[PDB]
Each structure stands twice: as structure tokens, then as C-alpha cells.
Write a protein that binds this ligand. Structure first.
Ligand SMILES: Nc1nc2c(ncn2[C@@H]2O[C@H](COP(=O)(O)OP(=O)(O)OP(=O)(O)O)[C@@H](O)[C@H]2O)c(=O)[nH]1
Ligand SMILES: [Zn+2]
Lengths: 305, 65, 114
């Protein structure tokens, strides 16, 4: 038996790792299970374009074309596919999209919006990647059972937000391993529950709590520096100094990623006693998560000999 | 400083750890021990080495205290 | 000849945040404790049931200092209530023993924290 906790702040990738434990270790989502996510894909798409439009007021951004004003009114009341397309391709809308760190926008927004033709067909069935990309908040615990290398994994997914903290204390008993997820792409983002709080500082202070807690003295601490794909893209246009004003390295994936790893690993106040097992991950990439989780399992076996 | 080490209520052989042990207070003793402090080891009662004999002969009161 | 003095039975040293929390408890400041309990719920910074080396707890120190509002706030934020009634009885104070007797049943949800 292995008790495994998926921890981390809101939107860090926890439940996406949980989706991967289905497909990687099992037959995975059925066409019928995929079909159940259609309304979520639609909602995520609609809510994302609404969020961008709404932000254009806060940001003092006009539509590229006046005709989009009526499309925006139509969008709020709601042909829908046409309206979303025209808005998304507008230059004002795109200027706002480019500045999404100044508001709250789902990571999968452009994924879906760029695939609007496909997802809007009457016969649309979400693909497995479409499912992995969905955003559904996780409130309460999500204990699921899986068996890897013949280990009986008892896996606990929990809410990452600060409102969901109350559930965390009940699950702390007998934890073999924690996978602590950190969205690499959050250095320049603010919390949805606190827009004067940077997301990466929030993830540090929790990791300071979770790594140094006396409950997890013998627990294997695994750090997933997640959303590596989004980070690779973002780092070329948003400087790391937003998060770490002292950083004098390059705004390149390898250097900036390495620096973040160092900042998190430095939070370990028992370095001559305890390892952190760090992996760079893309939680939506099945091949990557399978490889990383295999490695993680080996660490857990080796640490329970 | 000249002429102000005239009066001390404590004898010069008193180190802080010895006085903390004399007062028998747990917190002060713990704080002093945490800072790498030592106490000299007394010799055997039936000692006839050169330093014990010389110290007893020169100043017996200081040695006994 | 330099008898070595060292702590041969060393307890686990308190964290700095824990030291600040119990120093605030023994100080008697009501305002400082509440932000610590909210941040210990949210950020999990301070274990409320921590133990200074001289055999005392935050609820138990509040028992010795006989302050009842810090008692009420701590036990509202779910301190381990067991074995504290004996210290209140030995303190021979009516208010503390009445408060711990009255709030043994605060409509307890999800049993006790581990
Ligand atoms: N492309 C990509 N998308 C990711 C990655 N990690 C997370 N996402 C997406 O971003 C969102 C975050 O994933 P979630 O599973 O909701 O994150 P979480 O930490 O479980 O969120 P909570 O429910 O708040 O705990 C989802 O829409 C995911 O599909 C990643 O590495 N790559
Ligand atoms: Zn001698």
C-alpha cells in the first residue's frame, strides 16, 4: 500500500495528474466518458471569451472593429460559434488576450478557441487531449484507487485553493508520498482569490509548509514543476524578474526553469536530512507523465525497502 | 579603564556556568550549556602532583574555595 | 581539565513561528493570536498543538495565565482538549473548569483532527 497525496495551490495541475493515472495505468476515458466532458469544453470556451471581453473595460482596450460590440452583447445573452470566432479573431480582443496576466483566464482558453471549428461541429466528441485540457475546480477530497508496479495506490486529490485548506488536515495520516504541483507559468500571475497575491509566492509558502511539516518527515516529497510547455512559451515574452526581482539570468526556458527549481528546493530547512525529488512536467502530456510517474514509483519503492 | 575592577561580589574563580548551577535554574543552565561552556575537572582527593601541591602551598584558601 | 558540558538529551528545537506564537500566547495579546490561527488553518504555518521544552502548551499556558478569551479562541480553533481539565482543576479556578466542561460538545464535525 502507498498513500499518495496530490497537493499544491489552485490550478497547479493536480487533477490533471489524476486524469493521467487513469489513462496511463488503465484503459482510460471511454468515448462515452469523453462525451460527458462536452458541456465542460463548451463552458470553458464560453467563459474564457467572456473573461477576455469583460477585462477589456478594466484594461481600457477597444474592439478592433465596432461591429464586435453587438457580438459581445449576443455572447452574453447566448450563431454562437460565429460570434465567438469573430470576437476571438478581433484585434482588440487579441490585444486583451495578450495581457491576460492582468486578469483571470483559464490556461486552456486559446487551446479551445483556436480549435473552435472542430469543437463547434454538431457531431463533436471531445478527444482525450480535450478532456485533459478541461478546467473543473476540485472541491473536497478525490480519493481514487490505482495499482502501479503492484503497489495498491491510495491517491488523494484535494482542492488547491486557500478556501479548500480545511480538508487537508484530515488526510495527513500515513502518507507514503506527496506529489506537490507547481505551475511554472505562474510567476507573473495573481491569485483568483487574492489579486494582490502572486501565485508563485503562494506556492512557495505552501511548499514551505508542506516540505517542513512534521507529518511528512518520512514521506517521500516529489515536486512537479508543471506546465513546462506553457512556461517555455511565456518565458520568451514575460520576464522572470516579475516574480524574482533579484534574478540576473536569462529569460530562457533552461535558465529560468533551473532558477525556479532552486528557489523551491531552497525552502527545504532539513537539506542534510531530506531529499526533494523534482521533475519538470507537462501534466497534459501522457508520455511525459508516464515516464515521470514511473521514476517517482521507483523512488517510493526504494524509500520503503 | 583604570581602578574600576575594585569591587565584585563574586570571587574571580566563579564562571557563569558555575553560578548558574549554584542558583539551580533550568533555563539559564540550558542557555549556557547551549553555548559550548565548560567546567574544570577537580582532581582526586589523594592528589600529590606538582600543580595541586603548589596551588595549595601558595594560596590554600583560593584552592579550597 | 575541561569537562565537556552538552545537552545529552536534546529535544526537538521549536520553530521560529512556533516560538512567536507561544510568546504571543504567554504575552496575553488577544489580537496577535487570531491571525496566527487563521494562517495556520490556511497556510499550515503553525501547529497549534506544539510543545515548548518545559512541558507546556498554548491552551495549557492560557490555563496557567487564567485568561479565558484566549482559551475560547484557541479551543474554537480546535486545540487538543484532552488532559487540560486536570491542570485547570489544579489551578483551582471556577471559570476555566466551567469553560472546559461547557465546551466539551461544540457540535463536533468529522470527529477530531489527527
Ligand atoms: N497544456 C497544459 N495544460 C495544463 C498543464 N497543467 C495543467 N493544465 C491545464 O490547466 C488547468 C489546470 O489543471 P487542473 O487539473 O484543473 O489543476 P488542479 O491543480 O487540479 O486545479 P484545482 O482543481 O484547483 O486543484 C486544466 O485546464 C489543465 O488542463 C500542463 O502542463 N500543460
Ligand atoms: Zn593534582
Amino acid at each position: 500500500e502507498v498513500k499518495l497525496l496530490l497537493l499544491g495551490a489552485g490550478e497547479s495541475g493536480k487533477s490533471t495528474i489524476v486524469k493521467q493515472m487513469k489513462i496511463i495505468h488503465e484503459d482510460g476515458y471511454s468515448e462515452d466518458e469523453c462525451k460527458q466532458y462536452k458541456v465542460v469544453v463548451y463552458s470553458n470556451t464560453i467563459q474564457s471569451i467572456i473573461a477576455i471581453i469583460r477585462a477589456m473595460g478594466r484594461l481600457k482596450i477597444d474592439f478592433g472593429e465596432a461591429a464586435r460590440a453587438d457580438d459581445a452583447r449576443q455572447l452574453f445573452v447566448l450563431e454562437l460559434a460565429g460570434v465567438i470566432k469573430r470576437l476571438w479573431r478581433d484585434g482588440g480582443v487579441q490585444a486583451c488576450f495578450s495581457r491576460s496576466r492582468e486578469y483571470q483566464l483559464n490556461d486552456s482558453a486559446s487551446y479551445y478557441l483556436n480549435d473552435l471549428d472542430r469543437i463547434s461541429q454538431s457531431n463533436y466528441i471531445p478527444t482525450q487531449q480535450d478532456v485533459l485540457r478541461t478546467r473543473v475546480k476540485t472541491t473536497g477530497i478525490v480519493e481514487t484507487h490505482f495499482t502501479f508496479k503492484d503497489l495498491y495506490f491510495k491517491m488523494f486529490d484535494v482542492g488547491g485553493l486557500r478556501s479548500e485548506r480545511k480538508k487537508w488536515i484530515h488526510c495527513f495520516e500515513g502518507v507514503t508520498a506527496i506529489i506537490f504541483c507547481v505551475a511554472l507559468s505562474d510567476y507573473d500571475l495573481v491569485l483568483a482569490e487574492d489579486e494582490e497575491m502572486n501565485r508563485m509566492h503562494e506556492s512557495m509558502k505552501l511548499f514551505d509548509s508542506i516540505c517542513n511539516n512534521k507529518w511528512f518527515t518520512e514521506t517521500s516529497i516529489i515536486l512537479f514543476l508543471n506546465k513546462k510547455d506553457l512556461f517555455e512559451e511565456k518565458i520568451k515574452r514575460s520576464p522572470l524578474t516579475i516574480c524574482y526581482p533579484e534574478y540576473t539570468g536569462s529569460n530562457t526556458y533552461e535558465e529560468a526553469a533551473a532558477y525556479i527549481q532552486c528557489q523551491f528546493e531552497d525552502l527545504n530547512r532539513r537539506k542534510d536530512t531530506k531529499e526533494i525529488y523534482t521533475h519538470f512536467t507537462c501534466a497534459t502530456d501522457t508520455k511525459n507523465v508516464q515516464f515521470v510517474f514511473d521514476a517517482v514509483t521507483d523512488v517510493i519503492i526504494k524509500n520503503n525497502l | 579603564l583604570m581602578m574600576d575592577t575594585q569591587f565584585s561580589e563574586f570571587t574571580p574563580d566563579i564562571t557563569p556556568i558555575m553560578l548558574a548551577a549554584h542558583t539551580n535554574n533550568y533555563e539559564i543552565i540550558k542557555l549556557l550549556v547551549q553555548k559550548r561552556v565548560t567546567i574544570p575537572r577537580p582532581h582526586q582527593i589523594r592528589c600529590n602532583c606538582v600543580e595541586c601541591v603548589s596551588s595549595s602551598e601558595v594560596d590554600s584558601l583560593r584552592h579550597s574555595r | 581539565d575541561r569537562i565537556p558540558l552538552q545537552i545529552v538529551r536534546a529535544e526537538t528545537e521549536l520553530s521560529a513561528e512556533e516560538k512567536a506564537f507561544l510568546n504571543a500566547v504567554e504575552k496575553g495579546d488577544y489580537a496577535t493570536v487570531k491571525q496566527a490561527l487563521q494562517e495556520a488553518e490556511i497556510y499550515y504555518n503553525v501547529n497549534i498543538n506544539c510543545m515548548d521544552p518545559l512541558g507546556r502548551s498554548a491552551l495549557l499556558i492560557a490555563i496557567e495565565n487564567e485568561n479565558l478569551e484566549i482559551m475560547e479562541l484557541l479551543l474554537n480553533h480546535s486545540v487538543y482538549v484532552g488532559d487540560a481539565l486536570l491542570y485547570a482543576i489544579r489551578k483551582e479556578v471556577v471559570g476555566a473548569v466551567e469553560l472546559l466542561l461547557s465546551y466539551r460538545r461544540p457540535s463536533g464535525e468529522k470527529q477530531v483532527p489527527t
